[PDB]
């Protein structure tokens, strides 16, 4: 019996590297030897039961790798191909799915959450979830297609176009990918707010035209106020922090007629105040943006053509054995993305 | 000197019928003999200084009438024509105006607020604000084009289409016109929530497929709950009450992927709680809708073709002399729209 | 061995009723006892090889019926349920599919074309293609969900909204369903052009505000000319005839800023002249509309709620044995839809 | 009496530099000392009566300059300010205008066509047509805001977004500005077809990822064919040549589900063949794009922030006296934009 290492969430709180069998693919699956899988802040939440899951299960939902076996029903992608995986499996038979709102599937299953994921030497990827990318690419770059696709869906919703002004709240990997996607979609002012200096400097290397530090003073006045960066507000605010303060500032940063996109996840049940008078009189749009419906191919192509800076986003590369400790502890100071390389 | 009665807001709190000169039109104005002007809940707010204004000023911004004099620069509408007036004058030179967001003009002036309005025998209407409608029409029907246009802008924003399910919160004139516009835009379920029986019955006569009474139990469960009218939520919620409770219920009535449109005006500075987790995970849209940008002609045409029921919306017809008392007191029990006929 | 009648296209030109085995469902299929299947003009084309197919094959792609067996993997629709079938099976793995353009799937297979269809006592319907509708419904009404869904996609593309003016060219079943969907989507003028009197009268019974006869004079002048029904053109033209003349008139019927939607199928390779100067200077939109992407559930719900008149659309009800003759001959004089009842 | 040179179109065929009075502004006008006015191919058409005009009239509709006098009603832009002018004056009172389709105004008047334009030392610009830009800017850059705004409207219509693939047909100033706007709007492949080598090289300096020469072989195969640049077609084709061949190739370059935008002006009455079968079965959009509705401020801001390369677009700078000859003759070999500097 041929074995492999896998980082397994045994149950809420219990995570370790274990030896498991190499899975064998059904007729519509690909078996993929993982080149990289990214660690997400969702993975920490999954560990502490803050998001649901079906333990025991191999974590990891941000991965790419080389197809080493195809199932008998798969005929258009062969062994040797490189793919990135869309972890979100929609059912195709519920009313959300039949309306094209596949991200809102009521039977949604995610690879790395309800099915064994990418923190392992090998991972099973159903064919429909597999997106082919060039062999000439840097081997780890494909691991970014998933978080990039989430950001691209948000940027699509926002209406950013040539000449837009944009504020992004939060300088994690989502904020920083969003800075880049904002510039690519034509924004000529892209302001990023984040408390860490290192992350502000990185924002500027990957496209931010300015940055602000919310420790240093009132961000709303710094950005939107009479002597701020963009007096009267920006066209688009993208909230990428998932904390009450940034959600709360978002509408006051928007100009009249502007849009707020909520990418950040605030804990369930937690409440934040809005002012409906202002939403009406300034005709705002407040839009939730959830995962990656029909954008994975575009995301894969952006990475394939080198339109996105990926290398500066990688803070660290670790082994499978090191993963449980990194996932069990909070992120390090200037940390953007940690890649698990099996 | 030829005179006329006008209902004048002398200053905050002070309203009475006065004799004023018949205005003489500039070269781009029409002088219109008023056939009807509607009283709005905004008119009560204006009286008590809750919305700003430039007193002393003739109130009334929902009117139609017969052109009796044209200014020298006006050449395409002659004396004898019937028109309805768009009260909202945009400047055309500020950045909102140049972006096509004329409802967000930073120099906005409204007839009946910053300029003498329609509670008078005659009213001056700049040509660009005048929309011609048929002489064969019921003389008072034109007075509804303004509130109808506000509702039409909201319905446009909402995305209601053939087969949509819709909940409307508040059974004033805006709610009830919105019920009708929802059906016309293709909604096959249109549910109206309002506390007054009389207004629920009227809702059903003008297109509501069901009504609910928020006194009688939990509206959210009655509409969206497992054994409610539309289990799982409606496609579109239009909030037309302008109170904290309906704003607050709106998102919980929407299905995943749904839209909330805020038409109702909540007092400035007043705060209401949302749950950002739900907005994100259920990918909601929350949209403010403000007045009547580029929809006045369509609104006038809907009234001209008889697609909207207007007669059941008129609760009472009063004289100029009776107006100060009706405006100074709260609305009567089953009151929908009061028309001032000079 | 239990048998059934099926109308089989043996090969190009060869069509007859044959006895075939009752199919047995795979684990994701439903076996459906057909209550009705509609005959389409596409079925005549399929017979004469003008559209491709994989003979021998049972024709019929417009059907509804009662589930009599479920495959082992199907758990949410049981025997006894009534369903309508979406005949268009998309692959989910090609680039069109992954972009959400499932109607443009490059591996598209249609029930009744590449797979055995509904002109039989029983039909296999993969679960994802099955849409549940009420048992209380008229048994034959479900057979209209497919052509209705095609029309609904066209009407969605057109931008028809409250107060739109609309011309529809061609009074077959597509034109007539489109008249109804135009009114439901809020059009207040809906003009239908067709040469047959009987079909003009029917158009008026199901929502057309006027009709025109292209034999009787210049349709462009009758509709759009200075003394026509809508001087200067309509907002939306929907071409539903599939002949060179209606395609050619479409742009001249549209007002400046208007939209043309092409629903009609003109023979491959056939050419029609446009005037690019006019398309530019009058800023027209010309849009192709192809089948039924993500609209089948909405179509099924419109039929379920009785928002569409179906009974007046049924010209005749025939047996399986009568089908080969009706399909082999051209349509009769006032013929709208012929239903095959097994 | 203080005088100035002006390039005047005396009547069809007759163009020369003349001495005219310096105009005096009405109360809503600005008097602008011209820093630059661009020559357009429309100016040649105007000379030979191919487009209408109201001679005698000063030509020039692509200009910027310094405000030297304000009319008494103008209070927000003072002498000393730099502005670029929107030449297209809409009436605000026709049905197109009231629907927000200001580019389709039926009473449209253009500065440089129906009113004295920018080929003069001074030009009158009504305040609403004046867009302020920075004094720190290169003095001639403002002259590009008008053609840039036309291209921006086209790019908005096209739906180009992050990751789009694009073909542009014609390498004049419109094509080349469109290459730049395509890249800025997020296109990762931007292919430009033009016969002149010099213009292909320039396309590559300002953002084209590839270029093709339609003299060298079949452009449709070179771009969209099985071994072309983008097998199966691009997302967006923008036709910028205004000749029958490029209009005709446009649809065959588009992928299934793609968009064609027609910016190019083909002579009135001239006809080109389309294939309606292909438009339907490949669900294409063919969109006319006409001038600059509500995009002038965004265009001015793109030039103000330096997001567009302007200097490489200027082929030559000439005096007023040289203008009649340049306008009377066809454009020179590698000519992109000629600027008249008074
Ligand atoms: N919608 C979706 O489909 C989707 C997909 C993936 C992730 N997410 C969510 O998106 C959010 C960001 O994810 P991530 O992976 O980038 O997480 P992250 O590493 O937590 O990034 C968020 C960052 O926001 C910054 N921040 C905190 N408070 C702030 C404030 N008041 N103002 C400005 N910045 C502040 C922090 O950096 P400093 O320490 O420098 O301030 C923090 O690192 C999370 O809520 C995550 O759950 C959503
Ligand atoms: N966005 C715009 O451009 C625009 C334009 C015009 C007006 N407005 C605003 O729209 C709102 C409605 O105007 P209107 O003229 O129709 O005013 P209205 O006569 O005040 O109508 C609102 C109605 O809502 C009902 N209501 C109150 N609490 C409720 C609850 N908890 N649940 C359900 N219904 C409730 C009341 O009827 P019952 O007594 O039967 O409950 C009340 O009559 C106002 O806020 C107004 O300022 C906005
Ligand atoms: N896009 C899609 O997904 C889709 C789906 C289904 C069908 N289709 C296509 O849509 C078209 C209509 O289908 P159908 O089933 O309704 O077919 P149909 O029964 O052929 O209807 C077309 C009708 O157009 C009328 N007509 C012919 N020439 C005309 C003219 N010059 N002016 C006005 N009317 C004219 C005819 O009626 P009179 O004899 O009264 O003139 C004819 O009956 C066909 O081309 C079909 O292939 C497309
Ligand atoms: N929609 C609007 O609002 C708007 C605004 C301004 C201008 N326009 C129009 O847009 C068009 C372009 O204007 P422009 O000022 O850029 O004019 P231009 O200088 O005439 O540019 C068109 C260029 O197309 C190229 N061309 C000709 N035939 C070609 C072919 N078969 N394939 C590829 N390229 C070809 C030519 O360059 P080579 O010699 O290198 O081929 C020619 O220089 C004109 O029709 C103009 O009227 C429209
Ligand atoms: Zn689903
Ligand atoms: Zn303004
Ligand atoms: Zn496919
Ligand atoms: Zn106009």
UniProtKB/TrEMBL annotation, chains A, B, C, D:
Signal peptide: none annotated. It comes from the Bacteria. The keyword Transmembrane helix does not apply. Gene3D superfamilies: Medium-chain alcohol dehydrogenases, catalytic domain, NAD(P)-binding Rossmann-like Domain. Pfam families: ADH_N, ADH_zinc_N. CDD domains: threonine_DH_like. NADP(+) binds at residues 174, 194-196, 199, 245, 263, 265, 289, 291. The keyword Transcription regulation does not apply. InterPro entries: ADH-like_C, ADH-like_N, ADH_Zn_CS, ER, GroES-like_sf, NAD(P)-bd_dom_sf, Zn_alcohol_dh. It is an enzyme of class 1 (oxidoreductase). Keywords: Metal-binding, Nucleotide-binding, Oxidoreductase, Zinc. Its cofactor is Zn(2+). One of its GO terms (molecular function) is oxidoreductase activity, acting on the CH-OH group of donors, NAD or NADP as acceptor. Residues 10-340 form the Enoyl reductase (ER) domain. Zn(2+) binds at residues 91, 94, 97, 105. Its EC number is 1.1.1.-. Belongs to the zinc-containing alcohol dehydrogenase family. This is Zinc-binding dehydrogenase. The lineage of its organism: Bacteria, Pseudomonadati, Pseudomonadota, Alphaproteobacteria, Hyphomicrobiales.
